[PDB]
Design a protein around this ligand. Structure first.
Ligand SMILES: CCCCCCCCCCCCCCCCCC(=O)OC[C@H](COP(=O)([O-])OCC(O)COP(=O)([O-])OC[C@@H](COC(=O)CCCCCCCCCCCCCCCCC)OC(=O)CCCCCCCCCCCCCCCCC)OC(=O)CCCCCCCCCCCCCCCCC
Ligand SMILES: CCCCCCCCCCCCCCCCCC(=O)OC[C@H](COP(=O)([O-])OCC[N+](C)(C)C)OC(=O)CCCCCCCCCCCCCCCCC
Ligand SMILES: CCCCCCCCCCCCCCCCCC(=O)OC[C@H](COP(=O)(O)OCCN)OC(=O)CCCCCCCCCCCCCCCCC
Ligand SMILES: CCCCCCCCCCCCCCCCCC(=O)OC[C@H](COP(=O)(O)OCCN)OC(=O)CCCCCCCCCCCCCCCCC
Ligand SMILES: CCCCCCCCCCCCCCCCCC(=O)OC[C@H](COP(=O)(O)OCCN)OC(=O)CCCCCCCCCCCCCCCCC
Ligand SMILES: CCCCCCCCCCCCCCCCCC(=O)OC[C@H](COP(=O)(O)OCCN)OC(=O)CCCCCCCCCCCCCCCCC
Ligand SMILES: CCCCCCCCCCCCO[C@@H]1O[C@H](CO)[C@@H](O[C@H]2O[C@H](CO)[C@@H](O)[C@H](O)[C@H]2O)[C@H](O)[C@H]1O
Ligand SMILES: CCCCCCCCCCCCO[C@@H]1O[C@H](CO)[C@@H](O[C@H]2O[C@H](CO)[C@@H](O)[C@H](O)[C@H]2O)[C@H](O)[C@H]1O
Ligand SMILES: N=C(N)NC(=N)NCCc1ccc(I)c(Cl)c1
Ligand code: SF4
Lengths: 69, 70, 174, 100, 83, 154, 307
């Protein structure tokens, strides 16, 4: 019956789910649990490089708030 | 007695012309073909599970020869 | 070091040019030009020419050079002669290759060199711009301006492409 | 660096797959003109010329951000119309026919 | 006119793809001049501040120039909010 | 040593018999029963036997019909272009040994005069089911191969 | 960390391609009132593995130029994997500001593998078949590029993840279904899929083979993923990105399955007829719709943001 086509479709679907799910979780792991910063324009790169200096550990994804004021 | 397979005149009124325009641009007859193959996807297949299942034969079947006894 | 990436790409650029300029079979000459085109895009990319770099890939490689190979397969060579089997090609290839290496050796040893003209050898990074914090791509703004400032450029360019079609149909009708 | 790594990985893997694909244990001990057709040449050339016009249109999404929209819209349409005229000329001169 | 309609019916029957192409291309050329909304496209693009708005040296004779961003003088985007 | 060679043989045998791609030489009426074997009732594809493969991608040649003298050179040429391992299935009386036309001046008296044959399927024509039995018999022949075991003992 | 990410994309792509061959055979089978693979593993789940092993231990059966004989499959497979690295699912492996142009640029290079393999065939007739395939591919590149540009005039940029934002409220297939139709057909013709499978058609009138097959089937999946993003945008929830990945995978699977559905439903085009479909039908409409989509945002004051 037609639903015997599903197991092959399920395997294919799991194979295509892995890339997107892996990229998202690797990004969170590498960026302190947040989304990876997008810098398409010089202004965003400038802020990211300023964040790196302000972080105190050379990590643009480590944020300092009013505790540093 | 005979019949014509393909001797018809398309209606040239605006409604009929626009119907053919819609078929040309919206691929209606092609979509109608997709419906047929879709309906076969959901039909039980005709395949049998050989060699666990066998095609039907009759007593008249002509197979391998043999010499018989009384 | 990665700080010399543009220079390293430029060196590869020259070797690819010596490749097809010594003129092996046009099949291989076309290959050498394709490798130089890709490397040429990389040089442009590292100067902030993202859109310009990708146009070399899209248009120069994916368009013009595809048509070159298509025409070569159809009207020039169908089977390539073994590369460098010809003496003049091998001599020209070796001659150019040695000239490039002698250039590259000295500029790296002295961080400068005078090959007819004076060239600094500290690395192309030294001339880069030190302030950039705009919210847009300057290359994109300049290219987009074709439709606001470059009315006259659009007219003559568009006209020439139409005449290109007309002319080529005339040439080939015979 | 990431894009360079990705490209190097993709093509390095492709090279390796070709390698083992050509060398596995086997277990055995024992420049003329290619019947040139002018029509296929003109398809390639026509593609080239249309590809160069596409190169000119690619900036359009950015151009729409201008304050000079009157000029920008007029030039955008002018370019596309000239592309249509090119197609119309080729069409009416039998350049899109595959007979003869 | 009647000859115009007969011509259009003929092409509609034989070349609907080309008829649609020309009709769409004609609308693209004509409709911007007839649309009441085309004027806002100019205004919205101009209202997007890409670079810094450099302040003016106050000479005491600029009653139309705001002193603070929240002062009333200067362009307003209230038309854009309601759009 | 023995265990690895045996298991590896089982693996390559299973892959080769589970993915048998036939080149069918549909010479005459036996080709019709071959089409019926591909048809829904028997569905040779469900065994991993694709419907029609290119000769250079093929693993088994099915000679389905009378092989004439005029055709014999062409059939041998296709067989020689097949990549190994390659097998031949002779289908029906004509290909098996000439059949009804055995005594004709224009007919090869069995395709095994031209190519080596792995399986002979009798019948004029064999039924689609008979041919399928033959294909499965070929699968079992492939399952018996011990190429690596013999290689190890050279 | 990044090398792990690359491999968590490369490996699943090849596995997805392997099992698409099974899905294709079984979907075609059931539309043909039969079953397709169901003996080699339960429901045929080991069939791709048997086929893969078989092809790689087959005799690898003279090339007119060894360098190009090997270059063509490396180019095909390397380029095919490269087309995946900017795809947002929802986050791309590489976030390119001009990702759409990159995909257009890389796809235009894929025709070299056709050209090079025709040169290396060492046969006059195989070179001619390659040139016919190239002419088809570049012909449909024209409409694909113009259709893509038309859509981006509603998105505002060449960034692929911006298409997600553009379709936050509504799929782009609603304002652009005429373009979606020609885009979808163009992808079929671009990948030499039925009814545009003229290379396999006209032709009949081991490891290296497998490699070209993997490249083509990777391109088929990728093109339908691109179609899903371009016209059937999935909503992204930044705190639950897996929700996006599930919905977007289902759409891509269904689009891929419709490629098989279409193969099962129609006869083949003649070569001259598929050329007329492009140059005399799609291209006129694409040009007219390109003018229309340039004008529409301006005349509705719906110009998207640059960023
Ligand atoms: C930095 C600058 C750039 C440096 C470039 C680096 C190299 C990178 C590649 C560059 C492209 C090189 C292209 C070479 C090429 O393709 O030409 C093929 C050319 C003709 O190709 P062919 O059809 O195969 O015929 C081969 C012979 O010509 C035989 O053909 P033939 O039928 O005529 O046989 C008789 C032969 C007779 O030969 C002679 O009699 C010459 C004897 C003269 C003695 C003085 O004829 C010739 O030799 C013709 C040339 C005569 C000399 C001309 C006066 C100069 O062959 C050559 O001449 C080889 C010369 C290559 C040397 C490259 C040197 C580059 C330096 C340029 C000047 C820059 C200075 C700064
Ligand atoms: C990469 C690794 C891939 C491993 C593939 C393993 C295949 C599993 C398998 O052999 O199928 C069961 C098969 C099933 O047996 P079968 O092939 O004889 O099937 C019998 C059932 N009917 C009649 C329906 C066909 O087991 C074997 O055939 C024994 C040989 C094992 C081959 C694997 C060696 C490792
Ligand atoms: C066929 C073989 C495959 C060829 C691949 C061509 C590579 C083209 C990549 C260009 C894509 C791009 O523009 O982005 C890559 C990156 C710039 O990233 P981008 O987002 O566009 O802008 C900067 C950040 N906003 O730019 C870079 O990372 C710089 C890379 C320079 C080295 C590329 C050299 C390629 C040479 C190939 C031969
Ligand atoms: C108010 C202002 C409005 C302004 C905008 C107005 C625009 C909208 C109105 C116009 C509608 C445009 C429709 C565009 C679709 C393209 C139409 C087309 O090109 O069809 C014609 C083409 C050739 O037709 P033919 O009969 O062979 O001959 C005609 C020429 N002699 O026929 C074909 O193309 C056939 C295609 C062959 C391929 C067959 C396989 C595909 C079948 C399944 C398709 C499923 C639909 C795809 C959906 C994709 C989803 C992502
Ligand atoms: C005419 C036949 C031609 C054949 C062409 C092939 C067509 C295949 C099309 C496949 C796509 C069908 C849609 C499948 C839906 C999968 C489940 C799903 O995603 O549901 C969510 C959707 C609404 O959610 P969402 O997609 O995020 O839209 C918000 C805008 N961003 O829910 C809405 O449904
Ligand atoms: C929705 C519609 C409702 C109905 C009412 C609509 C009214 C408003 C629309 C008015 C537009 C009418 C324009 C129609 C002109 C069509 C002319 C024509 O019929 O040309 C066909 C003919 C080519 O046909 P051919 O196959 O070579 O020969 C026939 C042999 N079987 O002759 C040719 O050579 C083809 C013409 C040359 C090619 C030009 C292609 C057009 C340019 C491409 C871009 C499209 C336009 C700009 C964008
Ligand atoms: C073979 C050559 C073919 C060349 C084809 C050229 C076709 C050009 C057709 C449209 C050109 C003008 O198109 C449109 O017209 C209206 C006229 O009110 C202009 O005016 C509109 O926008 C401007 C903004 O600049 C507003 O100030 C104005 O209030 C508004 O009405 C638009 O700015 C212009 O975008
Ligand atoms: C995807 C990973 C798969 C891993 C599987 C690893 C298994 C390694 C053992 C492979 C054994 C292959 O077995 C062997 O394959 C080659 C393929 O040409 C066949 O062919 C070979 O032998 C024949 C003669 O017998 C020669 O004429 C031929 O030129 C040669 O190619 C052999 O007939 C077959 O016996
Ligand atoms: N066209 C089909 N869907 N069937 C089919 N016989 N495909 C080709 C089989 C194949 C090729 C390469 C690999 I890797 C794998 Cl696993 C399977
Ligand atoms: S064996 Fe019988 S059925 Fe087969 S080709 Fe010969 S005559 Fe025809």
């Amino acid at each position: 019956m037609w639903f015997e086509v599903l197991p092959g479709i399920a395997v294919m679907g799991v194979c295509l789910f892995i890339p997107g799910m892996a990229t998202a979780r690797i990004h969170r792991f590498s960026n302190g649990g947040k989304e990876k910063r997008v810098a398409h324009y010089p202004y965003q790169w400038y802020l990211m490089e300023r964040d790196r200096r302000v972080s105190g550990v050379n990590r643009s994804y480590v944020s300092k708030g009013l505790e540093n004021i | 007695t005979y019949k014509y397979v393909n001797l018809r005149e398309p209606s040239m009124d605006m409604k009929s012309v626009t119907d053919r325009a819609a078929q040309t641009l919206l691929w209606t007859e092609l979509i109608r073909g997709l419906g047929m193959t879709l309906s076969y996807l959901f039909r039980e297949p005709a395949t049998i599970n050989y060699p666990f299942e066998k095609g039907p034969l009759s007593p008249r079947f002509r197979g391998e020869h043999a010499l018989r006894r009384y | 070091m990665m700080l010399y990436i543009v220079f390293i790409l430029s060196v590869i650029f020259v070797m690819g040019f010596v490749g097809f300029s010594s003129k092996p079979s046009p099949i291989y000459g076309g290959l050498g030009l394709i490798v130089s085109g890709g490397v040429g895009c990389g040089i442009v990319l590292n100067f902030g020419g993202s859109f310009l770099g990708l146009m070399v890939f899209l248009i120069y490689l994916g368009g013009m050079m595809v048509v070159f190979g298509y025409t070569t397969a159809m009207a020039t060579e169908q089977y390539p002669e073994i590369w460098l089997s010809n003496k003049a090609v091998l001599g020209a290839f070796v001659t150019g290759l040695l000239m490039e290496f002698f250039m590259v050796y000295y500029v790296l040893k002295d961080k400068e060199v005078e090959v007819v003209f004076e060239f600094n050898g500290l690395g192309d990074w030294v001339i880069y711009d030190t302030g950039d914090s705009g919210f847009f791509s300057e290359e994109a703004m300049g290219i987009a301006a074709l439709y606001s400032y470059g009315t006259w450029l659009v007219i003559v360019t568009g006209w020439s492409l139409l005449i290109g079609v007309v002319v080529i149909m005339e040439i080939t009708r015979g | 660096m990431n894009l360079m790594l990705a490209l190097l990985t993709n093509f390095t893997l492709a090279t390796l797959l070709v390698i083992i694909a050509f060398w596995l244990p086997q277990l055995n001990v024992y420049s003329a003109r290619l019947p040139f057709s002018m029509k296929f040449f003109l398809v390639a050339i026509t593609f080239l010329l249309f590809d160069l016009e596409i190169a000119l249109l690619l900036p359009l999404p950015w151009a729409s951000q201008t304050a000079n929209l009157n000029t920008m819209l007029t030039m955008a349409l002018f370019l596309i119309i000239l592309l249509a005229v090119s197609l119309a000329y080729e069409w009416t001169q039998k350049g899109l026919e595959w007979t003869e | 006119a009647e000859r115009v309609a007969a011509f259009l019916k003929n092409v509609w029957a034989k070349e609907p793809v080309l008829v649609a192409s020309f009709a769409i291309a004609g609308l693209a050329v004509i409709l911007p001049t007839l649309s009441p909304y085309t004027k806002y496209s100019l205004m919205i693009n101009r209202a997007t501040p890409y670079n810094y708005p450099v302040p003016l040296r106050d000479d005491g004779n600029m009653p139309d120039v705001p002193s603070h961003p929240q002062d009333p003088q200067g362009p307003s985007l209230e038309w854009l909010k309601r759009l | 040593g023995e265990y690895v060679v045996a298991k590896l043989d089982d693996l390559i045998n299973w892959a080769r018999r589970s993915s048998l791609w036939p080149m069918t030489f549909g010479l005459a009426c036996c080709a019709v029963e071959m089409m019926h074997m591909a048809a829904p009732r028997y569905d040779m594809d469900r065994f991993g036997v694709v419907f029609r493969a290119s000769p250079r991608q093929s693993d088994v040649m099915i000679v389905a019909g009378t092989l004439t003298n005029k055709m014999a050179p062409a059939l041998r040429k296709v067989y020689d272009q097949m990549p190994e391992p390659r097998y031949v299935v002779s289908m029906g009386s004509c290909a098996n040994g000439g059949g009804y036309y055995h005594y004709s001046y224009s007919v090869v008296r069995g395709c095994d005069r031209i190519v080596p044959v792995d399986i002979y399927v009798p019948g004029c024509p064999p039924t689609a089911e008979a041919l399928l039995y033959g294909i499965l018999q070929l699968q079992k022949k492939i399952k018996r191969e011990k190429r690596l075991r013999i290689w190890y003992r050279r | 960390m990044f090398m792990i990410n690359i491999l968590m994309l490369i490996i699943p792509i090849l596995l997805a391609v392997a099992f698409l061959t099974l899905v294709e055979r079984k979907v075609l089978g059931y539309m043909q009132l039969r079953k397709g693979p169901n003996v080699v593993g339960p429901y045929g789940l080991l069939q791709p593995i048997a086929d893969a092993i078989k092809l790689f231990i087959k005799e690898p059966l003279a090339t007119s130029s060894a360098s190009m004989f090997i270059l063509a499959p490396i180019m095909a497979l390397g380029l095919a994997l490269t087309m995946w690295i900017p795809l947002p699912m929802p986050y791309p492996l590489i976030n390119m500001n001009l990702g759409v142009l990159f995909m257009l640029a890389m796809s235009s290079l894929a025709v070299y593998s056709i050209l090079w393999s025709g040169w290396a065939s060492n046969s006059k007739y195989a070179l001619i078949g390659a040139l016919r395939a190239v002419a088809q591919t570049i012909s449909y590149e024209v409409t694909l590029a113009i259709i893509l540009l038309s859509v981006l005039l509603m998105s505002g940029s060449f960034t692929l993840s911006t298409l997600i934002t553009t379709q936050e409220q509504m799929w782009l297939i609603l304002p652009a279904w005429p373009l979606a139709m020609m885009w979808f057909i163009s992808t079929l013709a671009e990948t030499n899929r039925a009814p545009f499978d003229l290379t396999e058609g006209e032709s009949e009138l081991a490891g290296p083979f497998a490699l070209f097959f993997m490249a083509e089937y990777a391109n088929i999946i990728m093109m339908n993923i691109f179609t899903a993003i371009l016209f059937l945008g999935t909503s992204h929830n930044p705190h639950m990105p897996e929700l996006y990945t599930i919905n977007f995978t289902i759409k891509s699977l269904l689009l891929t399955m419709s490629f098989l559905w279409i193969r099962a439903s129609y006869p083949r085009f003649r070569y001259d007829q598929l050329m007329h479909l492009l140059w005399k039908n799609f291209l006129p409409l694409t040009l007219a719709l390109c003018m229309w989509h340039v004008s529409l945002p301006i005349l509705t004051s719906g110009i998207p943001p640059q960023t």
